[PDB]
Design a protein around this ligand. Structure first.
Ligand SMILES: [Mg+2]
Ligand SMILES: [Mg+2]
Ligand SMILES: [Mg+2]
Ligand SMILES: [Mg+2]
Ligand SMILES: [Mg+2]
Ligand SMILES: [Mg+2]
Ligand SMILES: [Mg+2]
Ligand SMILES: [Mg+2]
Ligand SMILES: [Mg+2]
Ligand SMILES: [Mg+2]
Ligand SMILES: [Mg+2]
Ligand SMILES: [Mg+2]
Ligand SMILES: [Mg+2]
Ligand SMILES: [Mg+2]
Ligand SMILES: [Mg+2]
Ligand SMILES: [Mg+2]
Ligand SMILES: [Mg+2]
Ligand SMILES: [Mg+2]
Ligand SMILES: [Mg+2]
Ligand SMILES: [Mg+2]
Ligand SMILES: [Mg+2]
Ligand SMILES: [Mg+2]
Ligand SMILES: [Mg+2]
Ligand SMILES: [Mg+2]
Lengths: 62, 151, 50, 205
RNA sequence: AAACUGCGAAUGGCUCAUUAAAUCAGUUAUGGUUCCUUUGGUCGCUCGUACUUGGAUAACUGUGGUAAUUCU
RNA sequence: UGGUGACUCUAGAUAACCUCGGGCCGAUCGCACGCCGGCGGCGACGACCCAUUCGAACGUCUGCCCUAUCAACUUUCGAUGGUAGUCGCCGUGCCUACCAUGGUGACCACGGGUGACGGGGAAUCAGGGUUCGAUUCCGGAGAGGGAGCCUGAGAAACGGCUACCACAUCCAAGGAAGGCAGCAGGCGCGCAAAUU
RNA sequence: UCGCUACUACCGAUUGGAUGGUUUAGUGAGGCCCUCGGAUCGGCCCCGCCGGGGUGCCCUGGCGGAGCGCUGA
């Protein structure tokens, strides 16, 4: 006799392997935990700090 | 009273009347201060404007217009329009071939502030140019000189 | 009638050609952007929602 | 579309002229924006030069100056009482410049009673509420009571205005043209004009 | 390369049908207005995730349709 | 405070206002690399608003060929003016509402005609004129005829669009696409005019 | 004057025909404006179940299931 209902449909983002990184690599970096990432970050940060003060000494040398 | 003819209230847009006062100053008198401006070319703004009670927005003195442009003169012929008159300017147009002039004339519709009055057909009126007031009216009456036979 | 069918999550397509009046019976009198399960479409489809 | 051009027209004498050019953009007229009282509705138009003209289809609030005591408050508009131009325009309640309009007394009476600490438009029944008595009767300090008392000589109001407050509705007039402007803003009718317009609207009956 | 964006396409070129205080010429005004650009001015004057924020779309990949297009 | 021949100018102070179809305040780019974990040089775009330039748009004064076998004309549907508005980028019967009854005309209005775009100019000339100026500069109009809009700083644009009329192209008959008064060139017209 | 031949314009029924220009009236494509309309496309909530964090709850995450909830385009 009438329609009172307005349907609400949902949008879902699935996962696909992106060319050059297969779904195993995406999930390998995604599921990586806070200890691993924090270690990598602080290590790269300190390597970069060393290279940078080395290049500051290489600025004052020239 | 008698100043307000029209449906709308008749004001002098740049003056604020309703400024409040003591009941000792309300008993003294109500004189709403005129706005009048001195028009520039050395026409002394008539006495009848600065004292006078009338309100006309398009008058050069008591209202909003600025007189800039040509300044012309003519003679009054027909006044049946309200706050405007028709004046005619005569002149001689030279025809080269014949080496002589022919007479010619043009009719101007021009607005006239209610301060000037007793302006009588056939007398000299000097007008000055304004921004367009109406369809045919681009001018404004700056000063009125009587005809040669005034008593 | 040809059907142009698309799997979003897989990211693929196929062009299918359907001549059956029933299979289209399910689709007639339908607006765009409405969900119909594909049943009459074939044996394989079944629980497939289109 | 609608051309506000001058060349469709008789001469000063009245001979019709044959138009030399077909209609030009800049001579365009737009449709009339009539403005009604309701919940706020506004449509931006892009005009010559690329500037925004703000057009008002429905208005509610407008702000107004109570000029005597020199204040201005943001008020709610109620009704169109009078229009010099057109009676038809009163009937449909249309807001144009210089039509005349009823507004809420409220924010004014509040300001006033805060400034002068005096009763305004209150019934002779005199019935009051706690906030009212604490604002009006209040408490003072010596320098304070002298200030307020010094202003009490000043504040007295035209009997007409006084009445208006008692009714809750003030008579005002709109100086801004909502049609192009986007706001209906204006001033309270005081004194001579107020008495005048009152005479016109009593004359409307 | 393409495609998005920005800008230009209102100039220039052609013709003389209309058009008789109209166009137009000299003359003046805009204190009655709009102005991309260019040139100079302004651009911590406001007292109330930032070592960087949100979503989408074109080219591109692909599946297509129509006799037909600078269609989609 | 400053300015004009003259402002209801510019600047100042007070009360408020501020559009969801929103105003300003840089979430941007490059090249050099240097200085005491911090500092910065040159540029590129942007940007509200002044001012300026190119203008544009409306007004002022004076000026046009023939015609009386056109003498009165305009005004219920704006003619002329008044008052308040609407619209517009603003001044204005531009448009509405309400009043007034005006305005033009033998100094030739109004109407008709023009093998009429207006000028700068050309031909011819003792002095005076007469005739011509579609045509390379300046201004106006128009893109088959009318009308109506998008976009934009700027068009009522036609090498944009939407109709109707007139024309005409393609078609698988469902539909689609048109605009040389740009250059060439073709047809027609014609006494009359060039190379795809 | 009459007569013969030729050539021009004129009156002339035919409500003669054709074209152009205005326009009264009726009809009225198409844009623009207003009032609606609301196909669809989102966002926020509502819960269920589970994972991490913070203290039965709170902050998140991961899905899902659903309401004439209320908002934007
Ligand atoms: Mg600008
Ligand atoms: Mg492009
Ligand atoms: Mg540029
Ligand atoms: Mg600049
Ligand atoms: Mg493709
Ligand atoms: Mg008027
Ligand atoms: Mg006016
Ligand atoms: Mg009327
Ligand atoms: Mg011609
Ligand atoms: Mg000529
Ligand atoms: Mg010429
Ligand atoms: Mg030529
Ligand atoms: Mg030219
Ligand atoms: Mg044109
Ligand atoms: Mg042609
Ligand atoms: Mg542009
Ligand atoms: Mg066109
Ligand atoms: Mg062409
Ligand atoms: Mg062109
Ligand atoms: Mg050609
Ligand atoms: Mg031949
Ligand atoms: Mg030849
Ligand atoms: Mg009709
Ligand atoms: Mg229609």
């Amino acid at each position: 006799x009438x329609x009172x209902x307005x349907x609400x449909x949902x949008x879902x983002x699935x996962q696909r392997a992106i060319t050059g990184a297969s779904l195993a690599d995406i999930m390998a970096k995604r599921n990586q935990k806070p200890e691993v990432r924090k270690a990598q970050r602080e290590q790269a940060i300190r390597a970069a700090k060393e290279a940078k003060k080395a290049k500051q000494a290489s600025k004052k040398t020239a | 009273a008698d100043i307000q003819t029209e449906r709308a209230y008749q004001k002098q847009p740049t003056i604020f009347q309703n400024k409040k006062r003591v009941l000792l100053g309300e008993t003294g008198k109500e004189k709403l201060p005129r706005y009048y401006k001195n028009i520039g070319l050395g026409f002394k703004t008539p006495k009848e404007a600065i004292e006078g009670t009338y309100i006309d927005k398009k008058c050069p003195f008591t209202g909003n217009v600025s007189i800039r442009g040509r300044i012309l003169s003519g003679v009054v012929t027909k006044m049946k329009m309200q706050r405007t008159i028709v004046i005619r300017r005569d002149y001689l147009h030279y025809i080269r071939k014949y080496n002589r002039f022919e007479k010619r004339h043009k009719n101007m519709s021009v607005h006239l502030s209610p301060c000037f009055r007793d302006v009588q057909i056939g007398d000299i009126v000097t007008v000055g140019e304004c921004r367009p007031l109406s369809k045919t009216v681009r001018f404004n009456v700056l000063k009125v000189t009587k005809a040669a036979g005034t008593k | 009638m040809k059907l142009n069918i698309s799997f979003p999550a897989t990211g693929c397509q196929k062009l299918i050609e359907v001549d059956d009046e029933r299979k289209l019976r399910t689709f007639y009198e339908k607006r765009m952007a409405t969900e119909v399960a594909a049943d009459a479409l074939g044996e394989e489809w079944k629980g497939y929602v289109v | 579309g609608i051309s506000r051009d001058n060349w469709h027209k008789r001469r000063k004498t009245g001979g019709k002229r044959k138009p030399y050019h077909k209609k030009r953009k800049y001579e365009l007229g737009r449709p009339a924006a009539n403005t009604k009282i309701g919940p706020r509705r506004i449509h931006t138009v892009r005009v010559r030069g690329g500037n925004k003209k703000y057009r008002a289809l429905r208005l509610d609030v407008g702000n107004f100056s109570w000029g005597s005591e020199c204040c201005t408050r943001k008020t709610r508009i109620i009704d169109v009482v009078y229009n010099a131009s057109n009676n038809e325009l009163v009937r449909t309640k249309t807001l144009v410049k210089n039509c005349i309009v009823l507004i809420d007394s409220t924010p004014y009476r509040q300001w006033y009673e805060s400034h002068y600490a005096l009763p305004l438009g209150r019934k002779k029944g005199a019935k009051l509420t706690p906030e009212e008595e604490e604002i009006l009767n209040k408490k003072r300090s010596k320098k304070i009571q002298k200030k307020y008392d010094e202003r009490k000589k000043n504040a007295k109001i035209s009997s007409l205005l006084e009445e208006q407050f008692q009714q809750g509705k003030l008579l005002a007039c709109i100086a801004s043209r909502p049609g192009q402007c986007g706001r209906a803003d204006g001033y309270v009718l005081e004194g001579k004009e107020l008495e005048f317009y009152l005479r016109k609207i009593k004359a409307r009956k």
